[PDB]
């Protein structure tokens, strides 16, 4: 799990908590996860993303660990 958090951090130059959704979909595709683009889109629609610009990757990390 920490590895998922550090990759997300690799995508957070300011080590704070928010990165752009494209960056998030990208961190998730590099970690070697075999989650499909549609499932990602379904996880994105239930997450608040396009309509605000930046997402807190911590909630997406928590959901992937639970699953």
UniProtKB/Swiss-Prot annotation:
> For binding Ca(2+) 3, which residues are annotated in this chain's numbering?
12, 14, 16, 18, 23
Q: Which residues carry this modification: N6,N6,N6-trimethyllysine?
A: 34
- Positions of Ca(2+) 4 binding: 48, 50, 52, 54, 59
Q: Which residues form the EF-hand domain?
A: 1-34, 35-67
Q: Name one GO molecular function term.
A: calcium ion binding
Q: What else is known?
A: This protein has four functional calcium-binding sites.
What family does the database annotate?
Belongs to the calmodulin family.
The protein's job, in short, is: Calmodulin acts as part of a calcium signal transduction pathway by mediating the control of a large number of enzymes, ion channels, aquaporins and other proteins through calcium-binding. Calcium-binding is required for the activation of calmodulin. Among the enzymes to be stimulated by the calmodulin-calcium complex are a number of protein kinases, such as myosin light-chain kinases and calmodulin-dependent protein kinase type II (CaMK2), and phosphatases.
| Protein's UniProt name | Calmodulin-1
């Amino acid at each position: 799990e920490e590895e998922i958090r550090e990759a997300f951090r690799v995508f957070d130059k300011d080590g704070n908590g928010y990165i752009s959704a494209a960056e998030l979909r990208h961190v998730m595709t590099n970690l070697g996860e075999k989650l499909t683009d549609e499932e990602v889109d379904e996880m994105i629609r239930e997450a608040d993303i396009d309509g605000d610009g930046q997402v807190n990757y911590e909630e997406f990390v928590q959901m992937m660990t639970a699953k």
